[PDB]
Amino acid sequence: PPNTLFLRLEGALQSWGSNEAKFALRRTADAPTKSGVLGLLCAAMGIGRAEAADSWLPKLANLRMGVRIDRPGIRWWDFHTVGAGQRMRMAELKAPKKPSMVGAALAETLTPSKVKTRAETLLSRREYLADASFLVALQGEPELVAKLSAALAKPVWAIYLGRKSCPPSRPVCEHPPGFYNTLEEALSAVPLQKRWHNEPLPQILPCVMDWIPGYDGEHAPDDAEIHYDLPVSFQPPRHLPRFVIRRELVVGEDVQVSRETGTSVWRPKGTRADYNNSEYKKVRAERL
Amino acid sequence: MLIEIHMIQNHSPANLNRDDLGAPKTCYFGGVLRSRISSQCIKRSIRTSNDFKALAPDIALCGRMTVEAALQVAHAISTHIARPEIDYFVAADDVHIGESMFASACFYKYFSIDWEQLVKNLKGDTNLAAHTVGAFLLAAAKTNPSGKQNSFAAHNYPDGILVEFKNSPISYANAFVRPVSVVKESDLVEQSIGQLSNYVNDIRLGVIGFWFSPNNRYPLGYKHSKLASRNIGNLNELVGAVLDYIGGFKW
Amino acid sequence: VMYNLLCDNWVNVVYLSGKPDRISLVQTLKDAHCLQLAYSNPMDRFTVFRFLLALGYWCFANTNVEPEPDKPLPVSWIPWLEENKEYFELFGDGKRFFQADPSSRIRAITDLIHEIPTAHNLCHFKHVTDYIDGLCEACCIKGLLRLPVFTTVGGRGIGAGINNTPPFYLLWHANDLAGMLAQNWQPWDNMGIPAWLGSFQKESREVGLLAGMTWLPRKVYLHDPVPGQAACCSCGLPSEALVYSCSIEVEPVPKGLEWKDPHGVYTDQGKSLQSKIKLMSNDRYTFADRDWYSPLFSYLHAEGNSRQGKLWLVGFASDKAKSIDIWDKIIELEGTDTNDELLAQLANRATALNAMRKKPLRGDFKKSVGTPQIADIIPHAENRIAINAGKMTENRGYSWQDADTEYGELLTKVAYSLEPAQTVDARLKRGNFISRKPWPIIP
Ligand SMILES: [Mg+2]
């Protein structure tokens, strides 16, 4: 039975936010995050934000994760404005007479007229990756893999690429599950697809993997980094650190290249019939 | 189920969305630069419009402050290479040369609607959801962003719409990896529609859909192919067909 | 009711085996070499390390044992902190940690945290409401540690902290807590009295290290926690009774007060050197990326000099009482000399990028924004260039001309959009356009 499942993340625009976004400047990571993938799987299966934290996120946390960067996108920035021609909500509230009551007790007395608004325009800048493709392999129990593949075949809710304005360009369940021993073999099994006949093709594909602890102990190596993308909750968000390593695969020996398998340019139809074709002479004789 | 809407629309020289420096918004695709119209402009262009004002609706479709909106709008992208242009202007006195930016492009737009979410947000009502879907289709067909419209009266209408009922969400941006090059025996919109046709001619070889063009001006498929289940020349008839397929409601 | 920083768990760490945990100060000093400090926000990762460094300085001053490299922390440090258990308390009627006497200026506990909106701030990216959601004890401790380093002006009648505008913060990085403590150990002859000790006094001129590192520009009380079953709005941990309100008063900084921060970066005139990031591109600014090249000429010539290691940079942009952004970076430095002119040119690159952007496509016009398409491609080129930051700083194999190559492909792509013609004039114009690059300007 298969033990790993594959996901393809491709689109015109996508974003995977990083921990360095606490203000109106929202940046993105170079590779898809574990939290984003787990949230996509939860949305596909149909678990809400308050239910995922109960015995659905711990189960998916045990899965091993690895991403292969087929083609990387270009970092692009978008200027975003909020609330022009309207009023924005403020967080200011009247101080209580005594500190005895706060929170739920004071929330029951909240009224629509108690809130305060101000006429302003919020400014922000947001980062996206343009023309990027990623392959994610998740390894673990076979029953969970089968359930995830079945859910991904028909999603309960709409699935996007980190932000709701980023719909996929290719099906997420393009590659069927298989059986492999290590993440490297699973990532090398799926081939690499071209889009048209003559285009630049990367000679070396980077890959970002989780770091297996190996035997008991085995302190992390000196090239291991800390990523704060282990999901614990979604409302309110809560993330934990994890160790991540980077490797590479050189195409032509471990990753193959697929053909075009299609037509790009449309072009009009065919005029200019032939006066030497036998069919033309036959139909001309018949018409005569 | 999910209802997906694909639109192809050509716009006259205008500036419908610009950045802090006053230039039209852009993006990178297919190894080239393309024009872009932001998603939060098309939204708030379809929304807050007088035409769209036709269990509180307009919140189930687009939420506000765990409403879980059922409408998804993507970023409008161009089918060719971006061609920004600069206009030089001066101001008279009737008693200093400035420059402005403008561009013209053909855009592909993608919308998605989740029927089950719309029904659940309406507390079981099913006729109201169908009415909302029809109203949204009519509003999206006949609305444009209110940018520099007083100086660029760009009020063009879409030249082609496709409605699909696929099992999984997917966009056809990959049909425009190669930018469209205009030839003498065709035009830009026709070539874009042909490129779209040669992306559903495939896929199926290696669901149903409704195609709409004004008075059958541009037919999907440059042949007698059955790539479209029905071809309709009227917007109201397209709305009626979609309404029927949703489960048999009358517009 | 009762909470002690030596017993209760408030320090978030990750063990080198790969297990996240929340431990106490005593256990943090016990292990100190099998774990790293784990914090999403660089601010906390900096203030917790500063607090640990101050505690180590105090323990060394009162014990006279230094931390040996590649070894556990000194044992005798632990009993001393056990003796002074009365000075580390968060509540109760008596001595309070980093707090003062109660007042009547009641404020919800959200101004201690910059990223969570409060008062007049707009609650769009973080849905919060005052006196409705609060913080846990660990977040209160983490927000009390931000006062000496990250306090800005309050508008009218309220001043900044000891360092005025919060400047860049540059230090050294290691893969374990003991290593980080051992690479920034430099003590002084005069230490002073720390704030967590008895009532701090401004007294006379001169400051020292312990007093300066723990300067408190505000008085806070931290009234009490109120029972409930809510969740913290900072970490998201599902917890029990939180605090909601406190009292804050302003302490002015007396004139004079000769102080030089061990980690801060200063300008030629003695003013603080701060990050220059903004959300918009005005006439005198072009948004590219993190400005990692700004606190380099000052650091590598005044304090820190050339030294093999990992330089950790923390930058926090601000404008009056408004927060903008925070970022961090790590640069691998070998410590191979320095060139004054090249380092000065590197320290002034935002002006070069602005000059490159402002050049119009043709002609010369007053008040012209200039080629906005270049600003769309500048951030990607800056991000690509920033990878070889260590080699660019020391000019080992990377140079300004080497980094100038990254713009070629993007400018070639832009030229097709700018000149979409199949004529000779368009091709010549594209050839002229391709050869644009920033020019180094030293003053
Ligand atoms: Mg907390």
Short mmCIF file of all heavy atoms in Angstrom, two decimals, chain C residues 136 139 232 235, ligand 1:
data_model
loop_
_atom_site.label_atom_id
_atom_site.label_comp_id
_atom_site.label_asym_id
_atom_site.label_seq_id
_atom_site.Cartn_x
_atom_site.Cartn_y
_atom_site.Cartn_z
N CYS C 136 -1.15 36.43 28.92
CA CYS C 136 -0.79 35.56 30.02
C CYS C 136 0.44 36.11 30.74
O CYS C 136 0.98 37.17 30.40
CB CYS C 136 -0.53 34.14 29.51
SG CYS C 136 0.77 34.01 28.26
N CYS C 139 3.64 36.35 28.53
CA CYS C 139 3.60 37.50 27.63
C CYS C 139 3.76 38.81 28.38
O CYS C 139 4.36 39.75 27.86
CB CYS C 139 2.30 37.50 26.82
SG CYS C 139 2.29 36.29 25.48
N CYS C 232 -4.81 33.54 25.06
CA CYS C 232 -3.93 34.70 24.90
C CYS C 232 -3.95 35.19 23.46
O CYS C 232 -3.96 34.40 22.51
CB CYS C 232 -2.51 34.33 25.32
SG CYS C 232 -1.37 35.73 25.39
N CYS C 235 0.29 34.75 21.86
CA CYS C 235 0.80 33.44 21.46
C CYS C 235 -0.29 32.49 20.98
O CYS C 235 -0.03 31.62 20.16
CB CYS C 235 1.55 32.78 22.62
SG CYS C 235 1.00 33.29 24.26
MG MG D 1 0.64 34.77 26.06
#
